[PDB]
Amino acid sequence: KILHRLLQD
Amino acid sequence: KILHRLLQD
Amino acid sequence: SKKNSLALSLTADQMVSALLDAEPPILYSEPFSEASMMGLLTNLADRELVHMINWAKRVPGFVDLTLHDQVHLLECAWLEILMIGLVWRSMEHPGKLLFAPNLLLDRNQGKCVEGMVEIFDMLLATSSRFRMMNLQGEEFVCLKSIILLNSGVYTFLSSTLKSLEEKDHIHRVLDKITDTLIHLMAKAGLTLQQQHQRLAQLLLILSHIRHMSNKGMEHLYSMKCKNVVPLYDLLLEMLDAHR
């Protein structure tokens, strides 16, 4: 999930 | 071992 | 189907500038005991992961992918990417590994961690092969982005039309990079035969980096099972993507 956060922001 | 014999054979 | 990504329009010189411009910030690390050394390298890795997510977003073509495929590619390639930067950084430090400007470890310092020496030696060997070829930074940056797009490209979790669409796009960016590698080489004066030979010589090194990354993942997994690796969430997260 962190990866996902960083990729969208 | 086996590799050796086969390589020299 | 989307219209062609703008990333396929770039000339060779434009790809190079985009990859140079995207390089992540240089970082500095924060005797050694098994737990203390692994602490330094793991802390460096997790901070570098954060900047790798932003470097990825500036590699041409990467942002065109679905987020899910973007996550797959980072999960598969993160350790190879850190490893290739490491080998790059260490090219001018024979026998040593420059994890950071202020953290140059001797091969023997790898013996302080169970199993690390073998890893260090392959990392060092890669490092000498790059010195032997006089690897250029423009060539290095092309190889790091080929790694990010190629390593996860055959394990996408799907067979949908959309996945064929993504894979085909990833292969076209990969083809632009190849063209960019060939163009750096021609501009450098190599003959055509020299250019084809150097391209293969650099791509074959990618099988060795994949291998270093698979053993490092195993090694990193073991360390996580023996309770040595600090709880770094982004680094921990990425680790589980392989287990």
Add this chain to the structure above:
Amino acid sequence: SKKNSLALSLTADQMVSALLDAEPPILYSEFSEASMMGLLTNLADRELVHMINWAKRVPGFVDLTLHDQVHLLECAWLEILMIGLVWRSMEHPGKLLFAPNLLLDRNQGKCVEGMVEIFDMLLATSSRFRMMNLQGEEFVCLKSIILLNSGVYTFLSSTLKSLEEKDHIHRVLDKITDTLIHLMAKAGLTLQQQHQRLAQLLLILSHIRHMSNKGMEHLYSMKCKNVVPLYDLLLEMLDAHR
């Protein structure tokens, strides 16, 4: 230092002729977790023996020291079997042709613990080869590139003799690259197309390396769970990795 190996004077066409000639013989095979593993492992052990003789006919391999020759086969055997498998499976979508009389379905891999993931990579490799329209002359180049390339950075020896061996290996590797390119120009690819396909074929070698590293892991586990009563040559090769 040794005088130049005769393998570096071959032309593109002669290199191709020598790798086609050296192809090993086609073999036929002889399900429970133990039973399936029995058939693949039994096929692998027999293939390994013919792999020792295919290796001896790849130009430049016999010039190396016995010790280096041992190292190169130890690092690449699994990738060698894997690439031949993917090749043989290109025209059987969804299946892995271990042998003419032994075509397994993707689901049949679920019969072995941890195998389906391996099959899936294997099948994917296979689809990618179908999509490129991989030719056999290209395939022989790539299987030989795997024999010389995979153990070249791990000799763990820093002797003048070692530098001499690696330099010899990189020169045969360069002859193979040249052959790859010649096949491609002979087929009418454009210069840009030839450089594109050479990269496309070499990057698949990273995936193959990967499949091989997971297969060794899995092979090791199968040996530790006593699911397969592994034979000598195959057991021998597995120990080289662990």
